[PDB]
Design a protein around this ligand. Structure first.
Ligand SMILES: *[C@@H]1O[C@H](CO)[C@@H](O[C@@H]2O[C@H](CO)[C@@H](O)[C@H](O)[C@H]2NC(C)=O)[C@H](O)[C@H]1NC(C)=O
Ligand SMILES: *[C@@H]1O[C@H](CO)[C@@H](O)[C@H](O)[C@H]1NC(C)=O
Lengths: 294, 190, 49
């Protein structure tokens, strides 16, 4: 495979309000032949292009001839914008050097078309609104007023709307990942097991997702609970490391999050109905008869 | 029906097949007013969003993002490229909300970091996730601090020519009642 | 698994496990789990086999 010409550029970046960056263009002859190439850029009133090489044409180079070709331009619009340049090789001009073949195939003129982003002026955000309408074979209508213009920036603010019901989950690239026994500590282990548990629910439910890594995550969870045997308390509560703190309670998101799935996890490896009632009965105790227990 | 002040009214329709259909429409009015009307059976919800930029020149505010860029000016032919920027920050409202999450640290228009990768790579202050975004820096999870710390890191000049307006990378959330506490400084080499 | 066992000894003790729950600590979990195992074996009508 071969081309003797290829265009390298200045990737602008998501760029500042003032759009006069540094756009250049460089094609390089890797064929041994010195060929004139007539070049220009296709522009628009969407921006304030400025001719750097106004009067003279970037003309002609030879095999591996280095030339930098740039213009100035200070746009008006914001958002991603494509920039079209074109470079063509013409005939009957054996005058830029000794000679110029200038006889390519269907890939005759080199043309490049570049979506660059411009970042607008100021820190970016939005404001939205949320509206429902539920006529039951009837009619309902709503009005929504959309205004918070304090300390405003030029031509910066716009808006839109939509509504949706989507079906057909395509895919699962959002799905996979993994971590492990937290090298730094047993403290971050609470955030380990907690989402680890409901991965049971996904193996089969998903039909896009990777059940095996979640069928691995159970391989882990077959150890996960064993730590919770250690992270529990004797009276029944649970802590990061457990008992040795008697007449108190503890957090319950994690135990509440899990104690169901301990009971969904009570199929593969056996946890008893003792482990759940003891969890429970610890809870019933903390309830006062009248007060929302302190 | 999507009706506005400017004699404008765009209609849409929905069904079992338009179920999954996103219906995007914008308008250019400085007036923001959105009357709507629908019919049919069952309930359904549409949503809005209004994009806009802010922070033209905000005034100072409680929090201290302590950033310092360089030796006070380029004022030399080699500069505008290599200048290590030292950032030194801690808000005081730090009580009983969460672990240390928030940060933002990005590049200006035309500036590429390398060692910034490596200085973040080094830092770890008694506890740390060694977390990184590859355009930002995340060494924060720890216990409540009255201190700050700092760092310093440079770029290389990706943009030779740059119109005058800065970049500033601020996120600032400490307590619900007070103003949200911004502190700032740009790059001076210009 | 799916069986019961003798109960003289557990019945003999489970009180004194609760008299012994002063010096060294056994929980009210160890006694209710003992109990709730018992409630299960009861039929609704039959003197469970
Ligand atoms: C930050 O300030 C806090 C203020 O509460 C310090 O915590 C205590 O400060 C009191 C005096 O106000 C001392 O009597 C205590 O010995 C301090 N320790 C505690 C936890 O009670 C705290 O030491 C300071 N340092 C940090 C990083 O938190
Ligand atoms: C610009 O280029 C992008 C990427 O090739 C393309 O998706 C987009 O439609 C283009 N916009 C035009 C044609 O203006």
């Amino acid at each position: 495979a071969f081309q003797p010409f290829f265009v390298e550029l200045t990737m602008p970046y998501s760029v500042i309000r003032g759009e006069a960056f540094t756009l250049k263009a460089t094609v390089l002859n890797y064929l041994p032949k010195c060929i004139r190439v007539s070049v220009q850029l296709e522009a628009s009133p969407a921006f304030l292009a400025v001719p750097v090489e106004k009067e003279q044409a970037p003309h002609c180079i030879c095999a591996n001839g280095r030339q930098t070709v740039s213009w100035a331009v200070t746009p008006k619009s914001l958002g991603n914008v494509n920039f079209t340049v074109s470079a063509e090789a013409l005939e009957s001009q054996e005058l830029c050097g000794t000679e110029v073949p200038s006889v390519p195939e269907h890939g005759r003129k080199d043309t490049v078309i570049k979506p660059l982003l411009v970042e607008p002026e100021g820190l970016e955000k939005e404001t939205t609104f949320n509206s429902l309408l539920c006529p039951s074979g009837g009619e309902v209508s709503e009005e929504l007023s959309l205004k918070l213009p304090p300390n405003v920036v030029e031509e910066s603010a716009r808006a839109s709307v939509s509504v949706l019901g989507d079906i057909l989950g395509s895919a699962m690239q959002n799905t996979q990942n993994l971590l492990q026994m937290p090298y730094g500590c047993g403290e971050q282990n609470m955030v380990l097991f907690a989402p680890n548990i409901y991965v049971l629910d996904y193996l089969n439910e998903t039909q896009q997702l990777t059940p095996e890594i979640k069928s691995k995550a159970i391989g882990y969870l077959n150890t996960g609970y064993q730590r919770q045997l250690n992270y529990k308390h004797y009276d029944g509560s649970y802590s990061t490391f457990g008992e040795r703190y008697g007449r108190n309670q503890g957090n319950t998101w994690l135990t509440a999050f899990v104690l169901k799935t301990f009971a969904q996890a009570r199929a593969y490896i056996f946890i008893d109905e003792a482990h759940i009632t003891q969890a429970l009965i610890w809870l019933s105790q903390r309830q006062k008869d009248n007060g929302c227990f302190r | 029906t999507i009706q506005s002040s400017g004699t404008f009214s765009s209609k849409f329709q929905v069904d079992n097949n338009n179920r999954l259909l996103l219906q995007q429409v914008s308008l250019p009015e400085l007036p923001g007013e959105y009357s709507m009307k629908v019919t049919g059976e069952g309930c359904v919800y549409l949503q809005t969003s209004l994009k806009y930029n802010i922070l033209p020149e905000k005034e100072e505010f409680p929090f201290a993002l302590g950033v310092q860029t360089l030796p006070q000016t380029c004022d030399e032919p080699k500069a505008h490229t290599s200048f290590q920027i030292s950032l030194s920050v801690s808000y005081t409202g730090s009580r009983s909300a969460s672990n240390m999450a928030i940060v933002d640290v990005k590049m200006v228009s035309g500036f590429i970091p390398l060692k910034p990768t490596v200085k973040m790579l080094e830092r770890s202050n008694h506890v740390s996730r060694t977390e990184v975004s590859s355009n930002h820096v995340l060494i924060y999870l720890d216990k409540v601090s009255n201190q700050t710390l700092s760092l310093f890191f440079t770029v290389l000049q990706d943009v030779p020519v740059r119109d005058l307006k800065p970049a500033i990378v601020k996120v600032y959330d400490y307590y619900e009642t007070d103003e949200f506490a911004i502190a700032e400084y740009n790059a001076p080499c210009s």
